[PDB]
Automatic annotation (TrEMBL):
This is Beta-lactamase. NCBIfam families: bla_class_A, blaCTX-M. Belongs to the class-A beta-lactamase family. InterPro entries: Beta-lactam/transpept-like, Beta-lactam_cat, Beta-lactam_class-A, Beta-lactam_class-A_AS, Cefotaximase. The keyword RNA-binding does not apply. It is an enzyme of class 3 (hydrolase). It catalyses: a beta-lactam + H2O = a substituted beta-amino acid. The gene is blaUOE-1. Keywords: Antibiotic resistance, Hydrolase, Plasmid, Signal. Pfam families: Beta-lactamase2 (PF13354). Residues 21-235 form the Beta-lactamase class A catalytic domain.
Length: 260
């Protein structure tokens, strides 16, 4: 375990940025932590908590996921690959959740945040799960500014890994809702170059990526290797320069270091 820490510190030094890692290995409950109690801007990885809040709401409101939401041209923001195909049409809350999680559609995320009552309502759902660190302050895309020292829209790798474990494997959601969140994350289309690129190809992975200002490049994942116990992995990364380019390769390298 002294070797894995040295490897992460060296990966961080070579990258020029700030790396946050939290690995929970459910096989023995061991953890690998690197800046796991420091805050980082979640960017689009916050979409997991917004979809989960709607899933929690659906437990006491039958057929909530079938409720329809109109998409208007005025709702469109910087990245809406699914919503832009439904302008003057409607999408169900299930379709918005799938679009937010699988394509990282920002309009879909804003509909989810709005549905639960706004950013503070998403934060309140996090508190109800025992997550005292997560905070959602803004909507998409301003929640992705990732200004160094700004606590808005941040969490810690430790907090997010524990929450992701509670959501996907634990009892934070009702059985059906947990299975639905797992199905949505397994269907993600945006993660091939991030955590997944550091893992054996055959491993079943559910993840949610994100990126923002200051070259912020993130990924959160539940990993299920065949015939093994699952792992929960959060890899957050940020850089000194406001217009730095993304570093998905750093997340892949970190995933390989902590899983070898
Ligand atoms: C979330 O981080 N988003 C939305 C989208 N996510 O895709 S990723 O998960 O593959 O990264 C694109 C990046 C980010 C976003 O909106 N970035 N741009 C701005 C202006 O914030």
């Amino acid at each position: 375990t002294a070797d894995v820490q040295q490897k992460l510190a060296e990966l961080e030094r070579q990258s020029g940025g700030r790396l946050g890692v939290a690995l929970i290995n459910t096989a023995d409950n061991s953890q690998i932590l690197y800046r796991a109690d420091e805050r980082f801007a979640m960017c689009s990885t916050s979409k997991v908590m917004a979809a989960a809040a709607v899933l929690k709401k659906s437990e006491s409101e039958p057929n909530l996921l079938n409720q329809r939401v109109e998409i208007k041209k005025s709702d469109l923001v910087n990245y809406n690959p699914i919503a832009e195909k439904h302008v003057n049409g409607t999408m169900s809350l299930a379709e918005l959740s799938a679009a937010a999680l699988q394509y990282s559609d920002n309009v879909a995320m804003n509909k989810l945040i709005a549905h639960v009552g706004g950013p503070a309502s998403v934060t309140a759902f996090a508190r109800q799960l025992g997550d005292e660190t997560f905070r959602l302050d803004r909507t998409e895309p301003t929640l992705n500014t990732a200004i160094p020292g700004d606590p808005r829209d941040t969490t810690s790798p430790r907090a997010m890994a524990q929450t992701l474990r509670n959501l996907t494997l634990g009892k934070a959601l009702g059985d059906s809702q947990r299975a639905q969140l797992v199905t949505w994350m397994k269907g993600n289309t945006t993660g091939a170059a991030s955590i997944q690129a550091g893992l054996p190809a055959s491993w079943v992975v559910g993840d949610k990526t994100g990126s923002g200002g200051y070259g912020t490049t993130n990924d959160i994942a539940v990993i299920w290797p065949k015939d093994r116990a699952p792992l929960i992995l959060v890899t957050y990364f940020t850089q000194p320069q406001p217009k730095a380019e993304s570093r998905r390769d750093v997340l892949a390298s970190a995933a390989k270091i902590v899983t070898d």
